[PDB]
């Protein structure tokens, strides 16, 4: 230990309290696909675009039958505080389930705690896993990097149509021609959270584009 | 066993298309991304590989060392890549690592049993130019990767290193428009496993590149 | 375990909202009270943190420094401390330890499984110049602590170091009254367990200065 | 090792003051607050047995059960109940525990060698009518304990269980005021430790009401 | 290692003709079990192809061949489709793909000093019983001797039917193994990079392809 | 085991038929053929020592040292020897290992106790001038070895290391043709395993050079 | 590894030169004279076979199964006889065993290491009509045997047993005369151990039947 | 277990009817047949003793030491002597061995518990002028040694000693003849085992030189 | 081990000059003196079977089994049976065990090494007629016993038994003399120990029997 989860096997079995209330997993996701992601820790800026971005795209998950949900090792009392602030600060309300894993039972079972990363937080992973749940992919990308929510959704199509045709995708394979575009927005870097309260206070009078004391951007 | 983030890549000595290579000692001072794949002669792989020499520049001026790997011999590799430059008309430029008895494969996690207890998954590792592991994936036998993604990926990690930042969900350095088009949606039929059932492969009416590349759409 | 009167405090170093802190070296010629709650954003907690911020002045002219301790991330501390100074105009002016991997709560017995197997208790320590534990008390989840007895019982210990002393059943050190008022009548409604329970909780008609935190009165 | 909260109170039984109990048998249906004392003739606990003897009706109100502990005898405990009728005026009406071998005292983590290797140190439990561990103080050999705040402990714990709430810090049932007089300023000498000394001690101009209790201001 | 006399070792195992039990889905015929090292290397090509041109000597013996190498099915495939292109011979018989070297162990295939991750040139006659009766283990450098081995299984078929033995060099009837000047060619060892794979095509040998070129010496 | 390949061939000290010998301390320098053969006075063992003796000069030629090997003594050896020099008119050029226990065979993996418990089989071992085992085969008690093969592999082990080549299938140096007479057809009475049926089989009709060797054609 | 006198002689089964036995049940309610020689084609063993044989009526009529035993196999013992009955014109009567692993002549005792690690010692056994061992003897290989003392040996055990009595010192059952010729003086050459000497031995000057067996007169 | 031919023979200190020997070290130089006998005061032990004693010029001038040894003690071995030499005329010229504790017997595998648990078999060896056990006869309680055997045995080794050679079957020095006369059919009557039993066998018509040695013929 | 007394006296089966005994089986029922000497054919032992030879008929009448014991064999037995009639004119009427092996022996404590490793010492042991162990002597190889003694204290022990009494020192049944002459002073040469020295013992001058047994007196 700590393992690499294991492809072609039923996903860690686990039971956990969520912003939803308490899950059985993978169980009561039977006949649903599942992609279970982490984040490090609650009001952090990556971690926060990637919910934004997540959110943004429920609907083409709904619509794949993909049930999303996100783990970090956070109270469910910090994930509720935090949803609400993205909602105050963003407008946008998540709409799926964040799993409390304070203890790190989860985690380790999913091989999320990389040391020399933190020995305290979940790198950034994710896994998809089908209706019969069993997992199919993963990735584990670090603290500094956020993912590609359209990447997450390509792979979903990718697996599905593997089931439904019984195919192999290729490289860069989509189900439909489509473009994906990247705008000026999606060029603004982020400054690495302040650790201190002062430290807080301070970054508000930086000169960034803030949301709030956690969430700052500029551009490279 | 899970590769660790944040620690010195699994260190390994290996012949390759290229020749020897002293991991990841070799390519100090460069990125490195390390892939693997599950097996020479089969569709996905090729259409990787041929998707990763055509990006091969835009690796090359981002100081990242493509290398692949699976557990296919040395002389399958090169047979193989000679079958890529017939058929395709593109010459890989990277190494393929022959690693016969998976030694390299265990240490990186690529065997997954229930995939295979054969040959590696679609795993795919960047390493920075001090030989850290930073970022992993790994897709399934079925699925092939994402190529921009992988470019992407490098990016993030290069520019936070160099501008001391995080990078955001969907963050790309300049903006752009990943295209993708008819030709994407191709799908791939299973290969035939059997000789006789890569004969008749042939005659079945698809659009086959040789008789384990056999492209269709699917409605 | 139960820590012991009369010993050194158990030693640790820990992150907290002031940044990184040994204990006890870095407090010797202060007293030290030691405190922990449960979890960031729960109201008692915050009822807690308010009334030991109000009487920080309080603690500070008696040599005594305010350490708050959760399995919170410095992170969640932030952010409570920012909704606390925004809500109820107090800045909290002591420093919260984040215990990620509850290595100092459970050097300090507070986790008791019966009430969570992830929070600490409401335990709290005195802790002396010399960096001795002195006097501890563990209250439930349910149950805020009371501020102005933490007061006096730093007072008695101050004392009788000082006199050569012991100090006798609900001793003070000059007349004094402790009042209570209507408004510490008001009960704590249990904070919400899930995102929408924490969304119609606001429109329940209680006394909410956020979904976490509503208050009412009994009978 | 630390009783937890939220698990039944460490059972036990024991000799007291006024006869045999088993714990938690004898007590179902009834609040206990068990608090233990170093030493039986010796003058911060003697400032505590008055006070909660003082209340007891405020404890018997709220249906707890208050029962002290000591490693002393019930000879030497009864002895000193009859001093502290005769000094103070009021007759303790709760029982005391004689944990003569220390074995209640060691599953309750009373014992802290530092403090004392053959005393108790102040401890205090508030156990509920099913005989679950609610709430615990541990203070130390100088430091006498607040009544009031053990009522209100017990307050706040009845009113979150009635009421399935929690309670803030500071919180009180009704509003109410806790006034400390001058009375409450006065410390206490610590207790002579020779015969010769308890004589000179009665000698030395203290407000003493015994030779073990000699009050002075600071 | 493995014994003659006794059964030969079982196995299951994937071929370019499906999976094999092994010798159970063999029984009531001889069967000539072989090794090489690697698919796309040049002895291998010129054993495959002589087995391949006398598969009806085979045959007519109630014999099956079998070939085995730790390469994957589908590197066998396309080497027969190769061998197919090049030499216009189709390669008969199926090829086991052992590639965690399960088989390769049971049989002693694996020499370090040779290959750590290639079988040598090991070569089984399995009667119609399943039972090992001779064997040979040829290094790398060496390709095998095809009449020997039909020799051989002429010898122990004689054997088992007539109650005989055979003496040093018995044939069953009169006959001339002649070797001509294409046999006196040897083989230049093959090319392990892809850089050397193209140059060697201009190096002015007979290639058939880059991993197959001839001389003489 | 099985003697591995590319390795230094399994040292040992034997006695032989032309003294004492030190393996492979006293070859090197020299290629060696090491064969094996079940039991002196047996017939197709018999057949191979007359083709290797014949072939001696072929192998001398090639720098390589024959010796062959079985269980049997020093003087059955001999005898043996003798009898092939009055029979067949070849008197055999190179020394024939006694193994009396077993211990080399052992190291060369030559018992099959299935073909036999006492006796090696036909193996077979070519050894370079270095000592280092090259190739070997294994034939059973039944089946006659090919010696013109056995060259073979010499020539193409040999060219092998020269040139820095492989060889092909069916490869040799030069052109040629290996003839099979109507000699080369007959096939082998197993020889008699009592003296009562030694002495009947010399009188039932076969082509006997002596007891143990009597040839028939199918 | 001592045989026991008096106990059922160990038992074994074997090839011989005769088929195979199952020793000692094969020879119930005979008598049985088993013996050991170190090696088919040496010259004192080839000299006691035949003495043996000489004598076989002998042991005939004193119901008495000779039977031989070495390390050979049954291919180098029916050699070997064939080559007595050539060389001698006496053809051996009775079996010989071929112990190729040594395991009979290690149950017997017969291999003394010093003598040789390979050959049995000139190991000599009487087993009685039951099945028991009753006398033995183990001459080195320097020396031949005395075969009329194994004929009396077995007169004085049947003697015994048939007649309840002891036999003394060089006891017989009628007076008699062991004559000892010139021919019985000449000594034995140590035979050849390399081809090479064989070869050479012949043209030495001794009186040679064969190679292995040359007499002279000291 | 079995004394190994070729070795050093087993060493031992023992008393003798000569007084202490240190085997074989007091005897280097010399020749030994070391022999054993079940009893003293046995009849065939008797005639081999007397057998051996009329036959030491022939062991002497051969440079032979005769040494016996049984199990009975220096006591009764004199006394034995005593009685031979009264009832035969005979003086043993050589020394016997007291072997009580069967500490050599042992040594020497004399002890075959069938035969019996408590007396020697009759054993003998020969043993060379360096120590070493050359040769060794194992006969049982019922059967006397043939003394001629023993020093033709003698002569076998001495002269494949002296010569280099071995020695055929039935191999003499020089020709002669073994007379074996009327004296030598006699049989012995198993002694008896009481006293009372030993005064009856001398009245029952037996050829008795003593109550223990009785003979008849057959 | 010791003998021990008011126990059974050790049982064993034994070879002897009268045929087998079963001990103390075959003597129930009767006393036994079972007495150990160290060596057929040695002096002093010769005039102690004499002398319980002669005394044969005073056991006798006293229900007393004599029963001596060597390592020697029963073949020696009987012949120093023969001889010491022949010298001595009395035939030892009462069995003599063959201990060949010691097993005897060792169940009786009789082998005492620096004496003898290979000979018992004059052991004797007086058994009643319930195979019961009631006395021993063990002298050593140079002395002689006094048989007199041997029947007194036979004596005892059957009149103990009878009358339920003890008796004192020097006891005996009825007023008596013991009388040793100018014979009883005869001390006895040791014996010789070769061949040779006994030829040379019977050529030396003094009173010799045989050439075992030789006396002299001292002067």
């Known amino acids: ?13 686990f039971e956990a309290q969520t912003t939803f209330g308490p899950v059985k997993f993978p ?12 984040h490090p820790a609650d009001f952090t800026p990556v971690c926060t675009t990637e919910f934004v971005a997540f959110a943004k795209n429920y609907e083409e998950f709904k619509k794949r039958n993909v049930q999303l949900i996100g783990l970090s090792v956070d109270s469910n009392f910090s994930h509720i505080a935090w949803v609400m602030n993205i909602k105050e600060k963003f407008g946008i309300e998540i709409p799926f389930p964040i799993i409390a894993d ?14 020399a990363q ?3 937080f979940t790198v950034r992973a994710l896994f998809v896993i089908d209706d019969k749940g069993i997992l199919r992919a993963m990735i584990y990308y670090p ?4 993912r590609n929510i359209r990447e997450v959704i390509r792979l979903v199509d990718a697996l599905q149509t593997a089931d439904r045709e019984g195919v192999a995708t290729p490289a860069d394979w989509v189900p439909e021609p489509q473009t994906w575009e990247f705008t000026e927005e999606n060029t603004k870097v982020i400054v690495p959270p ?3 309260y002062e430290d807080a206070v301070k970054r ?7 949301a709030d004391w956690y969430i700052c951007k500029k551009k490279v």
């Open 194 to 196: 302040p650790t201190t």
């Open 118 to 120: 933190s020995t305290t």
């Open 27 to 38: 169980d009561d996701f039977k006949g649903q696909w599942v992609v279970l992601f982490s």
């Open 204 to 210: 508000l009078q930086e000169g960034y584009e803030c």
């Open 102 to 115: 304070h203890n790190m039972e989860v985690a380790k079972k999913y091989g999320m705690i990389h040391p």
């Open 143 to 146: 603290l500094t990097t956020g």
């Open 1 to 13: 230990v700590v393992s690499l989860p294991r492809l072609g096997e039923p996903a860690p079995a």
